[PDB]
Design a protein around this ligand. Structure first.
Ligand SMILES: [Cl-]
Ligand SMILES: [Mg+2]
Lengths: 195, 250, 244, 243, 240, 111, 231, 235, 241
C-alpha cells in the first residue's frame, strides 16, 4: 500500500493505485490491484495497514452486493460513500480500528454525473474534483490545483494523471512499481492496461 | 425457578375479542366514578373518595396525583394498579424527556408514554393488563390545556369533558347538556361538583370528594424565588375547605 | 409448570392456518374503515373514526392517520396502541436509513421491515400478533407514488386503490367499479369519500367522524408535500363534493 | 376444581393443597424426634431394617450442620439432604461474614425462608420432609421443627413421621414431669425409649436406633453421635421399659 | 426466552406441526419448475381474485438469491422472505470466504438446513413454505433444479411442481416430460411449463409468471405479451 | 510488580535406542543462589510406557505433567482402555501447551 | 393419574409418580448382582442382547482405579451419572491427592438425582446403579436408586427377577462375607447368586459380565473368555 | 399437553418411543459385517419418477474408515453427520490417529438425549454406523434416538426391518466373504422393497481397511444385481 | 377455569387468587388490633399456643422491622416471615440510600407495591397475609398503615384485623364517635395498651391471661414488644378498675 489517487473529470472518475506490496526490505509483489468493485458503477480504492485494507474492502463489497440483490437496484455513489464513512466512523472507536483510507469513485446514473469521495480511516468524508491519500497528496494536490480543469475529457484526465505519476516517480523516496488505472463512467468500470 | 411465563396471557378469541382487556374494562366499570372537564382557562379532574372504613384516614389515600408540575391524573378501577402507574409515569417523564430536553413533557406525550406501558401489559409475557382507566389533565406552552383518557388496552382519546367508572353513562349525558366552548374554570368546577353528586350516594363534602385543577401558575407553591421564567406549578389540589365553599353556592 | 396456561400463539391449525393471525384479522374487520387511493399526481388517505362522541376533542386528535416521515404516511385499522408501537419503530427505521445512506428511505423497504417484524410474532416468541392493518401511502424517486397494505400475518401487497377495516368487501367492490388509471387527486378525493359514505355503518357521514390526508407533488417544483387535513378543511371538502 | 394440580395455587379455602400433599409424604416416613434438655438438645431417629443385607451403623440419617447444629428429618430422605446442603451453605456464609457461628434461631429462619420459597412458584415442588433440628449457641440451647409449608416454631420436644402421635404423647409427659428441666444424659435415654415406643406404629420390620446430641457440658457445645457404651446403655434402658 | 417445544412427535410417529406446515404449502399458489437441455424455467401461478393490484411494486414470486441462482416458492408469503434473505446473505458470505459463488446444491442444502432447524428448535414453528431452487453452478452449463420442504428434506428434480393443485400438474409433467430427451431449447421448456400451468390456472392472462434462467448469470423475466403468445399458441393446437 | 514466573533450574536429557529409550534428569531444585531440595524428582512415569519431564519453572512443569497424566486417564475412559501411543501423546501435549499460548508454561518438555 | 404429568407434582397420598415410573424402568432392566467380603467387592451382571446378531449391552463401568458400578435401566443415564462420578473421583485426586470415599460417592449421586425430582422441565434419572469400591475403610457396596435413595449393603441385586438373587444373598450372608483373601470364591458366590434370577436362559461366555475391586486389586472388568472359568 | 421429557407408566420416554414409530415408516437400510469388510445398503424410495434418484443421499461418509447409513426422518440426520465428521476430524487433530468406531458412535449418541425444555425433540432417524479400526476390526453399530447403540454382526432398520432381520438371522455366519455379503444385502432389500429392485432405487456401499469407505457406482451395483438373479435361478 | 388458578382477570373483572389469598389471612384464627395515643402507637394481637410441646416464646406474629417501625401479621407464619424479612431489608436499604429512617407509611407503600406486582405477574403468588405497620413517625406522629394481598394500603386512626375484625372495628368506631377525636387522649403508653386490651375484651367477649396476648408498642425513636410479665402488670391494672 501507499499511493492512491483519484481525479473526477467531466464524464468520468479516474482512480490510480500503486502496484507495489512491500514488507521489510523486500518488494513481495509488483502487480497488486488495490481496489474492489462495489457495484457496476462504483469503485473503491484503498490503502493503509496490512491485512486491514483488503479485509475492509471485501467486507464493504459484500454488503453493497447484498443490498443490490435484495432491492434489485444499484445504490448511488453518495449513498455508498455514506455507508462506508459510517462503517469507518464506528471502527475508529472500536477495540481495534480498521486503519484503512479509501477513495470511492462512482458514476451516478440518475444524475448522469461522476463523483469522487475521499474518506480516511477516522470516517472523514469529502467530495472532491481530485483526491489522494498518504504522502502522494503533498505533491499531487498543488500539481492538480495548477493543471486541473473541471470540463476535461477522460483522455485529458489520463494525461493529467500521467503528470502526477511522473512527479511521484521523480520525488518520492520509495519505488511503488507504477500504478493500475481504472475509469468509472456511464458504461461502468474498465481498466487501462497500458500505463 | 425463574419466570417461565414468557408467553402472552392476553390472546385473540375466535370472535376477535381480547378477553383480558374486555375483563379489565369490566373491572373499570365496577370502579368508582371519576370525571374531567376542560375549560377555556383550565381543566378540572374530580372523583369520589370511597372510604374502605371510617377508621381509615382517606387523606393518606390520594386518588388524584401530580405527575408533573403542569400535569395531574385521576382514575377509575383498581387502586393498586393506578398507584404503580403513577410511579412509572412520574419516572418516565424524567428519564425519557426531562433528562434529555431540560423541561417537562407536554401532556399528549406523557400520556403517550403511559399508554405504551399499559399496552405492553396487554402483549408482554406473563402479565395481565392494568385494571384501570386514567383521566390525565394537563397544560403545556404550545398545546395549551388538554384532557386525555387512557384505557387498559393502551388506547387514549382527547376529551372536552368525560366521565369513567360506575355511573359514567349518566354522567356523560349530564356533561353533554352543560358543556360549552366558553366555560370559565370556575364554571367547570361548578359543573364537576353537580355531575359528581349524581353518582355519589352517601356523604357529599370536601372530605369525601377529591378534586384538583390545572389552571394558572402558582408562584406561592413554587418554593423559591429569583428565577423569572420559573413561575410555579399549574397543577393544584383543592383543599377540603375550598370544596365546601363552592358547595354552599351550588 | 407454566405449560398448562400457554395458548400457543404461533402454531398451525390442521387446515394450515395461523389461529391468532385469523382471529386478529377478525378483530380488524370491526375497526373503522380506512381507504387509500393512488392517483397519477398524488395519493389520498381517508379513514372513518370509530363511533365518535360529541364531547371528543376533534382537532387535536390522531387515531387513524400517522406520519412516518416527510414522504410516507400510514392509515391504521385495528388496535391504536399496537399501531403506535409499530409506527415508532417505522419512524426510527426511516431515520436509520437516512443516517446510513444520506437518502430518504424507499417506501417498500420501510414496508418490508415493518411487515417482517409482524411476521416474527407469528413464527416465534410465543406472543400474540399485532392486531393492526396498515395502509402505507408514500413517495420515492424510484417508483413514485405507492400504496401498500400489511396485516398481522406480516404479508404485504401493493395497490392502486385499497380498503382495510370494516366493510372492505363492499368498499373494494365500489372502488373497483369507479377507479381508473388516468385519475387525478381531486377525483380520488371524491371517490374515497363517496365510498366511505356508502359503506359506513353510521346514518350520515360528517366531518367530525373522518380523518383525511393527501400526498401530492402540489408543492413548488419537484417536491412532495404531506397534508393532514384539519377539521374545517374536511368540512369544506365534504361540502365541495356534495355529501353534506 | 383442579386447585391441587399446581404448587403455589390458592384453593377457595385459602390453602395450598400441594404443600398438604407433601405433608402426606412426611407422615408416610419413619419416626424422628427431638428433645430439648438443660444445656443442649438430643436427636433420635427410627431406621427400618428392610433386610439382613443392610450394614449396621453404616446408613447414617442424622446430619451435622457447621460444628454445633444437628439435623434429622422424616419423609423423602433426598429432600432432607438437599435442605441440609443449603443449611451448610447458609451457615458457612454467615460465619464467613460475621465470624461467629450461626445462631440457631438465625439458622432456623434460613431454612424456613428457603422452604417457604418452594411454595411461591409452580416450577418447584414443596419439600417432602419435616425437619427437626437445633443446637447450642451463645444464648443457650434451641430445638426447632420445620414443615413443608416453611412453618417452624421453637420446641421443648418435637416429633414427626409415622409414629408422631405416640411420640408426642410421650414427649408431653416428660414436659409435665420435668418442669425444672431434663439432663442431657437423661434425654438420650428417654429418646431411645420414645423411638422404641413409637416403633409400635411401624412394627412389621424391626429397626435400628440412632441418636445424636449437643450439650454445653457433655459434648462441649459441639454436635456428636452417641456411640458404643453410651448407645448400648440407652438401648438397654429402652428395652427394659417396653417390657 | 420462549422455549416451548411446538414441533413434537405424536403416538403414530408424526410431527403434526411439520405436516400442518405442508397444508399451508398446499394452500399456496401453484409453482412449477422445469429444466431443459440448456436452461431451467420457473413458472408461477398468481390468483385472480386480486384485481386493482399494482404489479410494478408487488413482490415477485420468483426471487434472485444471487446473479446465477433463483428461488420460487409455495405457501406463506411472509415466511418465504425470511428464507430468501438468509439465502442471499449466505450467498454473499460464500463468495467472501470461498472466493466462488455458491453451487445450486449448496444453496439448497443451506435453505433446507434452515427449514429443518425450525422443526426441532424450541419456541419456533416450522416454515409454511416449500421452495423450488434453480440455476447453474459457476463455470458450468448443466441445469440444476432442486426442491425443499418444511421438514428439511431436499432433492433434485428433472421437473417438479408445488402448491395447490400441484398433484394435477405433476400428473401432467410425469407423462409429458421425457428423461431421455428434455426440452432441447428455451421455447420448448417455457411452453411445457406454461402448458402444465394451464391445466390448473384458469386464464392465461396476468395469472402466469415465467422466469427463464440460463448459464453464466443469464436470468430474465417474461412480460405479459410474451407469455400470452404461448397461451394463444397452445390453445389453437389444443382445438384438434 | 508481581512476576508469575520463576526459574527452578536443573536439566534433563532424553536418548532413544533401538528397542529402548531413556529420560534422565538431575534431582536438584533451586531458586536464585539457594538450593531448595537435593532430591526433587522431575522425570515421571505417566503410564502406557510414557515417561515425561517438563523442566524450567517447576510450578508450570508439575501442572503440565499433572494435566497430561490426567489426559492419559481420560483417554482410557473415553476409548475403551486403548493404549496411548507416544505419537498421540506428543500431539496431545502440543494442545496442552498451545492452549496457554498467551500465558505460557515456562518449561522445556521432553517425553 | 392426574398427578403424573411431571416430577414437580405430588399426588394426594404424597407420591411422585414420575420418580416411580423411573423406578419402573429399572425393573424392566436386566439383572445385576453386587456383593462384598472384607477384602474384596464384586459386581456380577447379566448382559442383555437385542437378538442373536447383536452384541450384549455392557452393564459395568469403571469410575476410578478403586471404584466402579454396574447399571440397570436407561444406559445413557448411567453414562451421565458414571461420568459425573469419574469427575468427582478425579477432582478428589487432583485437588486433595485423595481417593474419593465410596460413601461420599453415594452422597454425591443422591444429591445429583434429587435436583432432577424437584424442578420443572427436567426428569428423574431412569437407571439404578450398584457401586462397589475399596477405600481407606475397606470394601464397600452401594445401591443407587434414581429417587435419590442410596444404601450401603453387604450384598444386593437390581433388575428383573432380582428378588431371587436378593433372597439367596440374604441366606448366604454369613458365608460370603468371610471370603477374605480369595477373589475367585467371592465371584463364584456372586455367579451362584445371579443364577437364582435366571429363567429359561443360562450363563454363557458372552452373556456374563464380572467385575472386582479389593485390597491389592484395582477395579477390573472381566468379559468374554475371561469369565469362562466361572460357568 | 404434556412435558417433552416425560416418562410413561411403563418406564419409557414418550417422545423417544414415538420417534421409533417414525423410524419404522422410513426406508429400509441394511448393514452386514464380515472379516473382509462391512457392507451398507439402502432403499432409496423415490416418491415420484421425475425425482432424480442419484440426488437421494442416504449413505454417507463420516471419515475414510467410517461410513453411515440412515432411515426415518433423514433431514434430522444432517446435524448428526456434521457432528460425527467434526468429532472424527477433531480427534485426529488432537491425537494424530484414526478415531475408534465405537468412540465415534458414542459421540453421536450423546446428542440423542440432549432434548427437552438443547433441541426441542429427539431425532426421528436411526443410523447404521459401519467402520474399521486397528483394535476391534470391522464393526457395525445401530445408533438410535434413545441414546443407545448396539454392535451388530448384521442389522436392518426401517419399514421392512423385522422381516429383513429374521432373514439376516438365518443367512449370517462368521465366515461370510465381502462378495457374499453384498449379494445378501441386495437379496434381502429386494424382498422387503415395495417397488422392484434395481441400480437406481437401491444403493450399496462398503468399508474395507485397504480402500476405506466407498459408495458403489450404479454400474457396479447393477452387475451385482444381475449376478444375484442368476445365482437364485441356478438352483 | 384456569382464570381462578393464576392472577388474571375473570369475565366479571375479578382476581380469584387475590380473593383466596384474603381467605388465607384468617387461617391462623387470630385477631389483631391497633390504636394511636398522643405520643405512641399500640398494637395488640391474640396469642394462641395449642400444642403443649411448643416453646411459647418463639410463637409470635409481631415483628421488629426497624428500630422505629413495628409490624403485626394476620396470616400463616411462613408468608408472615417472608414479608418481615423483606420489610427489614427494605427499611435497612432505605436508610443507607437516603440517609434517614424509612417512614412507616413509605414502607407500607413499598410492601404494597410488591404485593401489587404479585397480583399482575403470573409466576409469583400473592402472600396470604395482611401486614399492619406501626410507628411514631418523626413528621406525621403516631401512624398505623395496613397492607393486604390486593396491594391496597391506607392510613388508619385505629384498625383491627382477623376473623372477628368487624366486631372490633364497630367497637372502636363507636368509641371515636363518642370521644370526638382521632386518637386515644392519653399521656403514657401503658394506659393506651390498657385501652387496647379493654376494648378487645369487650368486642370479642373473652377474658385474657398473660399468655393469651401479644403486645407491641411504638414510641419516638423505638418500637418494642412487651414480655409476659409486662402484659400481666397491664392486665392487673385493668382488673383493678
Ligand atoms: Cl415501589
Ligand atoms: Mg480525509
Amino acid at each position: 500500500m501507499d499511493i492512491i489517487l483519484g481525479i473526477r473529470v467531466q464524464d468520468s472518475v479516474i482512480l490510480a493505485s500503486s502496484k507495489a506490496v512491500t514488507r521489510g526490505i523486500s518488494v513481495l509483489k509488483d502487480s497488486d490491484d488495490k481496489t474492489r468493485q462495489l457495484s457496476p458503477h462504483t469503485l473503491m480504492s484503498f490503502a493503509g495497514e496490512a491485512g486491514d485494507t483488503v479485509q475492509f474492502a471485501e467486507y464493504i463489497q459484500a454488503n453493497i452486493q447484498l443490498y443490490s440483490i435484495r432491492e434489485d437496484y444499484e445504490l448511488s455513489p453518495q449513498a455508498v460513500s455514506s455507508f462506508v464513512r459510517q462503517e469507518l466512523a464506528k471502527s475508529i472507536r472500536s477495540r481495534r480500528p480498521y486503519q484503512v483510507n479509501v477513495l470511492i469513485g462512482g458514476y451516478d446514473k440518475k444524475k448522469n454525473k461522476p463523483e469522487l469521495y475521499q474518506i480516511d480511516y477516522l470516517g472523514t468524508k469529502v467530495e472532491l474534483p481530485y483526491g489522494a491519500h498518504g504522502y502522494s497528496g503533498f505533491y499531487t494536490f498543488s500539481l492538480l490545483d495548477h493543471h486541473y480543469r473541471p470540463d476535461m475529457t477522460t483522455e485529458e484526465g489520463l494525461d493529467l494523471l500521467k503528470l502526477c505519476v511522473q512527479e511521484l516517480e521523480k520525488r518520492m523516496p520509495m519505488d511503488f512499481k507504477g500504478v493500475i488505472v481504472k475509469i468509472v463512467d456511464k458504461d461502468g468500470i474498465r481498466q487501462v492496461d497500458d500505463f | 425457578m425463574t419466570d417461565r411465563y414468557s408467553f402472552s396471557l392476553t390472546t385473540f378469541s375466535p370472535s376477535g375479542k381480547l378477553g383480558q382487556i374486555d375483563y379489565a374494562l369490566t373491572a373499570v366499570k365496577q370502579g368508582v366514578t371519576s370525571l374531567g372537564i376542560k375549560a377555556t382557562n383550565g381543566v378540572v379532574i374530580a372523583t369520589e373518595k370511597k372510604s374502605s372504613s371510617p377508621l381509615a384516614m382517606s387523606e393518606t389515600l390520594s386518588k388524584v396525583s401530580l405527575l408533573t408540575p403542569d400535569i395531574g391524573a385521576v382514575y377509575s378501577g383498581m387502586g393498586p394498579d393506578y398507584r404503580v402507574l403513577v410511579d412509572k409515569s412520574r419516572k418516565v417523564a424524567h428519564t425519557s424527556y426531562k433528562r434529555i430536553y431540560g423541561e417537562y413533557p407536554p401532556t399528549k406525550l406523557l400520556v403517550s408514554e403511559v399508554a405504551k406501558i399499559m399496552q405492553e401489559a396487554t402483549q408482554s409475557g406473563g402479565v395481565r393488563p392494568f385494571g384501570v382507566s386514567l383521566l390525565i389533565a394537563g397544560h403545556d406552552e404550545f398545546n395549551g390545556f388538554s384532557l386525555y383518557q387512557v384505557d387498559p388496552s393502551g388506547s387514549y382519546f382527547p376529551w372536552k369533558a368525560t366521565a369513567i367508572g360506575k355511573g359514567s353513562v349518566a354522567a356523560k349525558t349530564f356533561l353533554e347538556k352543560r358543556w360549552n366552548d366558553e366555560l370559565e374554570l370556575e364554571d367547570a368546577i361548578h359543573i364537576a361538583l353537580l355531575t359528581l353528586k349524581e353518582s355519589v350516594e352517601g356523604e357529599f363534602n370536601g372530605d369525601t370528594i377529591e378534586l384538583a385543577i390545572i389552571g394558572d401558575e402558582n408562584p406561592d407553591l413554587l418554593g423559591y424565588t429569583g428565577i423569572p421564567t420559573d413561575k410555579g406549578p399549574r397543577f393544584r389540589k383543592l383543599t377540603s375547605q375550598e370544596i365546601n365553599d363552592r358547595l354552599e353556592a351550588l | 409448570g407454566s405449560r398448562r396456561y400457554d395458548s400457543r400463539t404461533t402454531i398451525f391449525s390442521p387446515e394450515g392456518r395461523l389461529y391468532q393471525v385469523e382471529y386478529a384479522l377478525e378483530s380488524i374487520s370491526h375497526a373503522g374503515t380506512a381507504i387509500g387511493i393512488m392517483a397519477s399526481d398524488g395519493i389520498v388517505l381517508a379513514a372513518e373514526r370509530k363511533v365518535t362522541s360529541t364531547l371528543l376533542e376533534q382537532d387535536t386528535s390522531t387515531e387513524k392517520l400517522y406520519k412516518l416521515n416527510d414522504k410516507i404516511a400510514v392509515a391504521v385499522a385495528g388496535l391504536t396502541a399496537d399501531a403506535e408501537i409499530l409506527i415508532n419503530t417505522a419512524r426510527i427505521h426511516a431515520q436509520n436509513y437516512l443516517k446510513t445512506y444520506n437518502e430518504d428511505i424507499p417506501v417498500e423497504i420501510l414496508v418490508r421491515r415493518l411487515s417482517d417484524i409482524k411476521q416474527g410474532y407469528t413464527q416465534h416468541g410465543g406472543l400474540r400478533p399485532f392486531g393492526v392493518s396498515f395502509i402505507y401511502a408514500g413517495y420515492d424517486d424510484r417508483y413514485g407514488y405507492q400504496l401498500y397494505t400489511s396485516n398481522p400475518s406480516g404479508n404485504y401487497t401493493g395497490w392502486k386503490a385499497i380498503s382495510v377495516g370494516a366493510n372492505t368487501s363492499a368498499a373494494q367492490t365500489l372502488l373497483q367499479m369507479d377507479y381508473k388509471d388516468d385519475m387525478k387527486v381531486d377525483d380520488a378525493i371524491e371517490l374515497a369519500l363517496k365510498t366511505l359514505s356508502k359503506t359506513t355503518d353510521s346514518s350520515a357521514l360528517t366531518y367530525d367522524r373522518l380523518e383525511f390526508a393527501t400526498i401530492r407533488k402540489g408543492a413548488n417544483d419537484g417536491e412532495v408535500y404531506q397534508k393532514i387535513f384539519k377539521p374545517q378543511e374536511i368540512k369544506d371538502i365534504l361540502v365541495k363534493t356534495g355529501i353534506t | 376444581t383442579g386447585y391441587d394440580l399446581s404448587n403455589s395455587v390458592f384453593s377457595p379455602d385459602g390453602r395450598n393443597f400441594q404443600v398438604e400433599y407433601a405433608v402426606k409424604a412426611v407422615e408416610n416416613g419413619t419416626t424422628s424426634i427431638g428433645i430439648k434438655c438443660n444445656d443442649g438438645v438430643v436427636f433420635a431417629v427410627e431406621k427400618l431394617i428392610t433386610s439382613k443385607l443392610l450394614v449396621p451403623q453404616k446408613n447414617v440419617k442424622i446430619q451435622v450442620v457447621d460444628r454445633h447444629i444437628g439435623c434429622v428429618y422424616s419423609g423423602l430422605i433426598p429432600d432432607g439432604r438437599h435442605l441440609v446442603n443449603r443449611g451448610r451453605e447458609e451457615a458457612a456464609s454467615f460465619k464467613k461474614l460475621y465470624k461467629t457461628p450461626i445462631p440457631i434461631p438465625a439458622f432456623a429462619d434460613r431454612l424456613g425462608q428457603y422452604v417457604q420459597a418452594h411454595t411461591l412458584y409452580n416450577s418447584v415442588r414443596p419439600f417432602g420432609v419435616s425437619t427437626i433440628f437445633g443446637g447450642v449457641d451463645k444464648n443457650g440451647a434451641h430445638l426447632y421443627m420445620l414443615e413443608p409449608s416453611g412453618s417452624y416454631w421453637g420446641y421443648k420436644g418435637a416429633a414427626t413421621g409415622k409414629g408422631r402421635q405416640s411420640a408426642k404423647a410421650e414427649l408431653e409427659k416428660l414436659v409435665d414431669h420435668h418442669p425444672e428441666g431434663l439432663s442431657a444424659r437423661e434425654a438420650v435415654k428417654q429418646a431411645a425409649k420414645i423411638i422404641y415406643l413409637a416403633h409400635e406404629d411401624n412394627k412389621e420390620k424391626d429397626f435400628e436406633l440412632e441418636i445424636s446430641w449437643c450439650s454445653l457440658s457433655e459434648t462441649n457445645g459441639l454436635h456428636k453421635f452417641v456411640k458404643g457404651d453410651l448407645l448400648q446403655e440407652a438401648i438397654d434402658f429402652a428395652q427394659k421399659e417396653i417390657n | 426466552g420462549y422455549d416451548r417445544a411446538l414441533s413434537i412427535f405424536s403416538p403414530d410417529g408424526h410431527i403434526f406441526q411439520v405436516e400442518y406446515a405442508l397444508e399451508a404449502v398446499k394452500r399456496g399458489t401453484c409453482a412449477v419448475g422445469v429444466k431443459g437441455k440448456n436452461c431451467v424455467v420457473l413458472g408461477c401461478e398468481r390468483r385472480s381474485t386480486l384485481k386493482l393490484q399494482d404489479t410494478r411494486i408487488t413482490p415477485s414470486k420468483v426471487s434472485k438469491i444471487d446473479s446465477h441462482v433463483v428461488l420460487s416458492f409455495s405457501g406463506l408469503n411472509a415466511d418465504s422472505r425470511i428464507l430468501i434473505e438468509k439465502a442471499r446473505v449466505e450467498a454473499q458470505s460464500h463468495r467472501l470466504t470461498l472466493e466462488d459463488p455458491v453451487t445450486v446444491e449448496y444453496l439448497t442444502r443451506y435453505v433446507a438446513g434452515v427449514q429443518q432447524r425450525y422443526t426441532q428448535s424450541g419456541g419456533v414453528r416450522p416454515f409454511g413454505v416449500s421452495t423450488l431452487i434453480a440455476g447453474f453452478d459457476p463455470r458450468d452449463d448443466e441445469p440444476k433444479l432442486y426442491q425443499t420442504e418444511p421438514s428439511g428434506i431436499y432433492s433434485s428434480w428433472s421437473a417438479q411442481t408445488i402448491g395447490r393443485n400441484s398433484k394435477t400438474v405433476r400428473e401432467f409433467l410425469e407423462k409429458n416430460y421425457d428423461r431421455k430427451e428434455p426440452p432441447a431449447t428455451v421455447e420448448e421448456c417455457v411452453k411445457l411449463t406454461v402448458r402444465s400451468l394451464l391445466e390448473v390456472v384458469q386464464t392465461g392472462a396476468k395469472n402466469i409468471e415465467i422466469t427463464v434462467v440460463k448459464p453464466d448469470s443469464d436470468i430474465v423475466a417474461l412480460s405479459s405479451e410474451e407469455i400470452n403468445q404461448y397461451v394463444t399458441q397452445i390453445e389453437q393446437e389444443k382445438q384438434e | 510488580q508481581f512476576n508469575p514466573y520463576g526459574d527452578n533450574g536443573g536439566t534433563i536429557l532424553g536418548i532413544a535406542g533401538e528397542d529402548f529409550a531413556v529420560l534422565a534428569g538431575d534431582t536438584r531444585n533451586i531458586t536464585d543462589y539457594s538450593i531448595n531440595s537435593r532430591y526433587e524428582p522431575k522425570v515421571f512415569d505417566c503410564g502406557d510406557n510414557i515417561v515425561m519431564s517438563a523442566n524450567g519453572f517447576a510450578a508450570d512443569g508439575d501442572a503440565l505433567v499433572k494435566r497430561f497424566k490426567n489426559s492419559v486417564k481420560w483417554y482410557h475412559f473415553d476409548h475403551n482402555d486403548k493404549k496411548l501411543s507416544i505419537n498421540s501423546a506428543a500431539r496431545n501435549i502440543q494442545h496442552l501447551l498451545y492452549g496457554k499460548r498467551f500465558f505460557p508454561y515456562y518449561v522445556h518438555t521432553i517425553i | 393419574n392426574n398427578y403424573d404429568g411431571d416430577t414437580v407434582t405430588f399426588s394426594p397420598t404424597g407420591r411422585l409418580f414420575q420418580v416411580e415410573y423411573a423406578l419402573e424402568a429399572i425393573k424392566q432392566g436386566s439383572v445385576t448382582v453386587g456383593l462384598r467380603s472384607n477384602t474384596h467387592a464384586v459386581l456380577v451382571a447379566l448382559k442383555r442382547n437385542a437378538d442373536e446378531l447383536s452384541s450384549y449391552q455392557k452393564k459395568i463401568i469403571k469410575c476410578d482405579e478403586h471404584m466402579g458400578l454396574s447399571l440397570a435401566g436407561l444406559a445413557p443415564d448411567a453414562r451421565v451419572l458414571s461420568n459425573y462420578l469419574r469427575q468427582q473421583c478425579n477432582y478428589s485426586s487432583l485437588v486433595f491427592n485423595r481417593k474419593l470415599a465410596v460413601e461420599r460417592a453415594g452422597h454425591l449421586l443422591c444429591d445429583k438425582a434429587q435436583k432432577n425430582t424437584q424442578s420443572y422441565g427436567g426428569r428423574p434419572y431412569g437407571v439404578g446403579l450398584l457401586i462397589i469400591g475399596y477405600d481407606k475403610s475397606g470394601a464397600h457396596l452401594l445401591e443407587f436408586q434414581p429417587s435419590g435413595n442410596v444404601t450401603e449393603l453387604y450384598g444386593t441385586a437390581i433388575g428383573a427377577r432380582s428378588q431371587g438373587a436378593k433372597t439367596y444373598l440374604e441366606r448366604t450372608l454369613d458365608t460370603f462375607i468371610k471370603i477374605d483373601g480369595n477373589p475367585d470364591e467371592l465371584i463364584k458366590a456372586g455367579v451362584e447368586a445371579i443364577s437364582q434370577s435366571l429363567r429359561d436362559e443360562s450363563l454363557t461366555v458372552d452373556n456374563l459380565s464380572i467385575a472386582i475391586v479389593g485390597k491389592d486389586t484395582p477395579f477390573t472388568i472381566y468379559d468374554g473368555e475371561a469369565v469362562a472359568k466361572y460357568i | 399437553d404434556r412435558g417433552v421429557s416425560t416418562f410413561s407408566p411403563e418406564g419409557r420416554l414418550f417422545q423417544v418411543e414415538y420417534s421409533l414409530e417414525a423410524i419404522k415408516l422410513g426406508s429400509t437400510a441394511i448393514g452386514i459385517a464380515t472379516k473382509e469388510g462391512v457392507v451398507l445398503g439402502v432403499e432409496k424410495r423415490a416418491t415420484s419418477p421425475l425425482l432424480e434418484s442419484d440426488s437421494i443421499e442416504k449413505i454417507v461418509e463420516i471419515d475414510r474408515h467410517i461410513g453411515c447409513a440412515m432411515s426415518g426422518l433423514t433431514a434430522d440426520a444432517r446435524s448428526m453427520i456434521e457432528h460425527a465428521r467434526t468429532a472424527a476430524v477433531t480427534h485426529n487433530l488432537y491425537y494424530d490417529e484414526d478415531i475408534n468406531v465405537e468412540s465415534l458412535t458414542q459421540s453421536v449418541c450423546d446428542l440423542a438425549l440432549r432434548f427437552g425444555e438443547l433441541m426441542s425433540r429427539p431425532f426421528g432417524v436411526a443410523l447404521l454406523i459401519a467402520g474399521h479400526d486397528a483394535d476391534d476390526g470391522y464393526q457395525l453399530f445401530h445408533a438410535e434416538p434413545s441414546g443407545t447403540f448396539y454392535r451388530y454382526n448384521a442389522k436392518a432398520i426401517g419399514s421392512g426391518s423385522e422381516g429383513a432381520q429374521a432373514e439376516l438371522l438365518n443367512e449370517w455366519h462368521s465366515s461370510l466373504t465381502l462378495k457374499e455379503a453384498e449379494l445378501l444385502v441386495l437379496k434381502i432389500l429386494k424382498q422387503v422393497m415395495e417397488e422392484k429392485l434395481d441400480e437406481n432405487n437401491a444403493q450399496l456401499s462398503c468399508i474395507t481397511k485397504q480402500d476405506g469407505f466407498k459408495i458403489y457406482d450404479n454400474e457396479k451395483t447393477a452387475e451385482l444385481i444381475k449376478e444375484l438373479k442368476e445365482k437364485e435361478a441356478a438352483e | 377455569g384456569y382464570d381462578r388458578h393464576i392472577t388474571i382477570f375473570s369475565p366479571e373483572g375479578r382476581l380469584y387468587q387475590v380473593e383466596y389469598a384474603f381467605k388465607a389471612t384468617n387461617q391462623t384464627n387470630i385477631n389483631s388490633l391497633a390504636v394511636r395515643g398522643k405520643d405512641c402507637t399500640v398494637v395488640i394481637s391474640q396469642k394462641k399456643v395449642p400444642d403443649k410441646l411448643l416453646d411459647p416464646t418463639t410463637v409470635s406474629y409481631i415483628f421488629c422491622i426497624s428500630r422505629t417501625i413495628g409490624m403485626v401479621v394476620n396470616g400463616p407464619i411462613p408468608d408472615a416471615r417472608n414479608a418481615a424479612l423483606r420489610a427489614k431489608a427494605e427499611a435497612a436499604e432505605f436508610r443507607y440510600k437516603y440517609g434517614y429512617d424509612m417512614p412507616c407509611d413509605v414502607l407500607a407503600k413499598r410492601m404494597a407495591n410488591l404485593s401489587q406486582i404479585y397480583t399482575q405477574r403470573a409466576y409469583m403468588r400473592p402472600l396470604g397475609v395482611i401486614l399492619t405497620f406501626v410507628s411514631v413517625d418523626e413528621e406525621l406522629g403516631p401512624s398505623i398503615y395496613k397492607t393486604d394481598p390486593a396491594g391496597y394500603y391506607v392510613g388508619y386512626k385505629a384498625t383491627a384485623t382477623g376473623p372477628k375484625q368487624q366486631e372490633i372495628t364497630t367497637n372502636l368506631e363507636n368509641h371515636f364517635k363518642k370521644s370526638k377525636i382521632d386518637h386515644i387522649n392519653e399521656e403514657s403508653w401503658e394506659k393506651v395498651v390498657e385501652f387496647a386490651i379493654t376494648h378487645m375484651i369487650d368486642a370479642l367477649g373473652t377474658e385474657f391471661s398473660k399468655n393469651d396476648l401479644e403486645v407491641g408498642v411504638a414510641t419516638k425513636d423505638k418500637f418494642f414488644t412487651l414480655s409476659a410479665e409486662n402484659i400481666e402488670e397491664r392486665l392487673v391494672a385493668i382488673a383493678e378498675q
